[PDB]
Ligand binder design. Sequence first.
Ligand SMILES: [Zn+2]
Lengths: 206, 98, 155, 127, 80, 60, 24, 125
Amino acid sequence: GNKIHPIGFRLGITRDWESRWYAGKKQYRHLLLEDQRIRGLLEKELYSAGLARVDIERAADNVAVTVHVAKPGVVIGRGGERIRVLREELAKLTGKNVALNVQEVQNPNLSAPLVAQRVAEQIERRFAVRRAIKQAVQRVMESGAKGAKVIVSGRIGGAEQARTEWAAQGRVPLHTLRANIDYGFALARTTYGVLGVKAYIFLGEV
Amino acid sequence: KIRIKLRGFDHKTLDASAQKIVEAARRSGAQVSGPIPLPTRVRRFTVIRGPFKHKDSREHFELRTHNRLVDIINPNRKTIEQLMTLDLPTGVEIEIKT
Amino acid sequence: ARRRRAEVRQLQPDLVYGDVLVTAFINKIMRDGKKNLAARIFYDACKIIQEKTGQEPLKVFKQAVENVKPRMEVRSRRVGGANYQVPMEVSPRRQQSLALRWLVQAANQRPERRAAVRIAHELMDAAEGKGGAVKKKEDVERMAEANRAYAHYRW
Amino acid sequence: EQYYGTGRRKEAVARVFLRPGNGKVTVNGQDFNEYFQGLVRAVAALEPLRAVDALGRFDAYITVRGGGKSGQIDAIKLGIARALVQYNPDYRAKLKPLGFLTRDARVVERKKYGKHKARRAPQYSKR
Amino acid sequence: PRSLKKGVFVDDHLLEKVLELNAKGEKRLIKTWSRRSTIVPEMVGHTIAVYNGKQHVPVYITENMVGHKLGEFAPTRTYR
Amino acid sequence: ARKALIEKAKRTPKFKVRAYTRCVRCGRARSVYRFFGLCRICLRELAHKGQLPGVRKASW
Amino acid sequence: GKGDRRTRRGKIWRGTYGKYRPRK
Amino acid sequence: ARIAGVEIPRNKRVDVALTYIYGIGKARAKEALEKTGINPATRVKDLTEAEVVRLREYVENTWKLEGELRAEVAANIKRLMDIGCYRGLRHRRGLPVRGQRTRTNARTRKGPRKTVAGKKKAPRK
RNA sequence: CCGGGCACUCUAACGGGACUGCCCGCGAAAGCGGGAGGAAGGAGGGGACGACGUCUGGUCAGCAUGGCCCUUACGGCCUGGGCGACACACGUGCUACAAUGCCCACUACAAAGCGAUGCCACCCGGCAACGGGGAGCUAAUCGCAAAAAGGUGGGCCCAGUUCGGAUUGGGGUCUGCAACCCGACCCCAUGAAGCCGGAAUCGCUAGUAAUCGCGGAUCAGCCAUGCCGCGGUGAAUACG
Ligand SMILES: [Zn+2]
């Protein structure tokens, strides 16, 4: 049980925060619990949209929130009717009065969280783990990326003995503090139990 | 004599921010006292790495807060024009007391 | 020390005699890094060597060290079963370390209530060839040369 | 007219101002022998002077803040060493070989976790 | 070397319930979980039964034991 | 950390000394930091994600 | 020493003030 | 000079010396000397018959000392010991009274360790 | 302190600097030795950072989760007790056995932190904890804060002591609805063991060990002699 989170490790560089807003002492804890409330619903809802990140900027009673998706449609809605439901369901949580932008994911095949969830799902549907994994690494590796790697937890195939599956291609330097490796974790509830899924994608460097 | 005090988490989101405030008003008031730094206050959070035991795991987390000042003496309407409503950064938050 | 041959830390000379050997002795008196009290004691002592002795303290000191340096010492060693105490020379370096250490030790073994005195009197006694310091020194040589049979285990 | 040299040691800063004169020293006001009232080491600070037969030829006003009177004694020693160069830059030839123009970089070592004092590791019994 | 300050504390479960019995003289028993309370004169003569945390032990309150605190007369743990 | 034992939010301390922090995410009452409302664990989990604004990894 | 609660050090050690380590 | 109940502190500083009395500590020392206006540094032998009377009288009559005191203290303990007072039971049982741990460290109140047989393999380390 | 002045210290942001780059020596090369300059070197000093895997390692008691079990209850509320028990055994520590020391007074250098009912200036009542009053601070501009070891002067005079503070009696402060069980603090009295520790055993290679005090998190208060961190003074030794 070693190695740090590849993101948290690189936060100073090659990776910005998910919530970039000043605050302090009396507020910070309140102004943060909120962010989690926010993210809470978005992930509980926008699942089929393909969640990947939830930036949350601030300045004062005019929050940001910039959900990133693979299928920006599912988010918005018909003509923009859903972005009405949510955007409203939002203030029924934070009187704060906040926006709700939506950026599209340029190739969900380079989004560790996505590749992860991608695999997490297949596994839930009962696909061959090792296959799903190799495939995933291929997709990711086959559409850009200077390196990728996926890891599935254990009880592969519902086996009584928890195992751990691999798969990796090209440089994926977890040690190099400047790599720019996207990390993504996906759960996977199952008849037999939870099985975590980890996706690592390497892009450029400097 | 409008004393501005800028605080931010990013030492760039300020040098950028507080620097705008300098170039702007430098054409409608005095000449600004230049963005003077000011000591940073760091908050350390030393936490045990894993749950249950392992007293010597740890790993350190700090939340450093940075400050900037500036100071514009000789306030002249246009100063409060080039500044009043032309900011940009989001990871910043000001407090001014002329 | 598996790799290098750990070189000796070179000490800054005395703030009065500019003699390094003195600093060394002062460092052996020091405890808990209270190097001032340590320096004092040795100087107060040097002035006690001036009164009760018409000689220059610095020379009494060096004379002492000299008589307290063992030239032969016994070092244990496992040789076919038993641990025979092999007698052997003593490096110039080790001679000092031991001499100074022994002085301070025997000095703090004396009775006189005052630290600075025990050092003063110990040094003198050492110069004359008497005192707890020189005891150990002569005891060591005696130990060797009394085991000079196993000296063919030269080492 | 005047000469300068800073000087820092183990977290101490000493403003050293030499000035052709008697050879006295005003450390933070008090006399050299007054601030360092009874410290067998003090004598050190002025060593860079005796280095080139100064002292009884110069004079020194010194501001010292930070650390301990021991660290200050070394900062000041470096100050008097630097300043003594802005004056005559030719002093290096003899002032440096002594190492007075170096900035002892030995500082306290961070206190690492798991250990009692950065290194002093806790002890065990019947391990 | 005990100390409360200014305002000798006594829960008024038994207080206003002990003095009410002072009107008709005394009574025959009491029982409070307030071992937290100090003992005042009005308690003297009486017989309050304190709680072990399991039992209600009968404690005859005499003068010699006023200033104390009931619980000090109802042992908790069981040893030897 | 049983729903039942998260009556901490009940205010009603009857006396304000019965009040107690509790994790605002897992209920981990045991080592909850104030400045975050989070326990030593969650604080570490989130710091790794970047969801703790300007909370980088220390080192010196 | 550091342990005598009624001395200078005893007070300093226990980080307190009293008749033995007054405020000034 | 002999002062309180069989008290004879001599040849030392008067303060120090008064300390040798049951109810007198380094505190009452400087005071009894303070009030009675006597140098504390004077060697008990070098004292004056006049000072030894003001001391002998001021002290003996101002504080409850010696035997009479041990009588009180003993009397106290006996009391909280007669009444079901827990604190009193701690005296009977001979265990520490001021609520300390009695699983380890209570030797000052228990006496010498009274070792018994025990259970080995069960890392009692 | 005042005007004034950014030089200096510093504050924090950026830029420079080290690369065996230059000189001599050996080498095929990598590089080893030596020397100059330099604040600094041959990885300049300390962190973050832990490979494929191992131990059926640790945690379902942080959280998550398969399966099993309980549902007037293996759920829930409350008051009180318990987690603080002791004939004993061990681990990690604190304080100490003293004169390179202890006590009183006077006087001097630090860093990193924290502060809204919060830090608490200063003044008063109290031996004191602390209480009353009340300024500033929203905190490089006010407070915690006194650094301690240290320097100077005095006392102690080798004694279980002006060492050492356990234990116990009494008085009292403070937080808190509430301090019997079971808080910390103050003052008086008490003043224990301990005179340097058997077999055995632990740490640390330099600003390290050793020693001295300072801050923080948790937190009403606090059992902190713990933990994380700060600076002061500052060694011995390494043949092998
Ligand atoms: Zn939590």
